[PDB]
Amino acid sequence: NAMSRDLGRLLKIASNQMSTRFDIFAKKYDLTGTQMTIIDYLSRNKNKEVLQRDLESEFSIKSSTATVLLQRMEIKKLLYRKVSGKDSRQKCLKLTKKANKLETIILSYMDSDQSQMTSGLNKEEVVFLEKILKRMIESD
Amino acid sequence: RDLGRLLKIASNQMSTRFDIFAKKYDLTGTQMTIIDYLSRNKNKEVLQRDLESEFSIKSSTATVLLQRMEIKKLLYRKVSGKDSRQKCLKLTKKANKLETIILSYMDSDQSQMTSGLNKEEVVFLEKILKRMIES
Ligand SMILES: [Cl-]
Ligand SMILES: [Cl-]
């Protein structure tokens, strides 16, 4: 065939493999893979105020989707909403002490996993792919 | 790390676009991808295990997907020549009517995704993704 389907077919396989691994590792601490990625995000960004809109931008998810995800983690006592000084009106996201204990394990994993996943790759391959994915995501 | 995040977004954007297109023809995006594959591979017999290897999906996942396609009258199954113990997957006349529009859609989606890239950059990307899958 003139066209190869490999780029799309393999992007879906790679992404689904990664999200499978994440769920496996996360279910061991009573967490979905996605929730686990949220905890990872907030821990690296404790210095400043993460609003829900900042999370939406970073994970490229809709308000409705972020709304419902954050609701559950609060119910699970993993985060809470706290009044922010940046946006005098909007609530910023904070980790509970329960989520604080998982941080070291999670951040270790989220440097084990992507390290794992990219381990066969050279640095400039990772750089190349990151640049093209960024563009692909913008212009959707 | 930014990589993992971006990989998930780009894959989910693509599944989203595929579903929007496919729903116009009473298909899911994944079902549409199977039609596309079988349409491009009529030169060979495609067993379930072949489709499992090509999409890297579990046997149970494949069973369910193909069963639902057969209920939708999109595929049927006949005894294969390469392995008499297995049946190969074939497109129905119903699915044949969708082949040209699915192939164009998929050709076109890939070209929108790789807009501005040279051929060699697209090949390099495919290879990088294959290598990741094997880590
Ligand atoms: Cl193909
Ligand atoms: Cl056929």
Automatic annotation (TrEMBL), chain B:
SUPFAM superfamilies attached to this UniProt entry: Winged helix' DNA-binding domain
Domain HTH marR-type: 1-134
Keyword Chloroplast in record: no
An MF annotation (GO) of this entry: DNA binding
Pfam families: MarR_2
Keywords: DNA-binding, Transcription, Transcription regulation
Gene3D superfamilies with a match to the protein in the record: Winged helix-like DNA-binding domain superfamily/Winged helix DNA-binding domain
Protein name: Transcriptional regulator
UniProt source species: Oenococcus oeni (strain ATCC BAA-331 / PSU-1)
Classification lineage: Bacteria, Bacillati, Bacillota, Bacilli, Lactobacillales
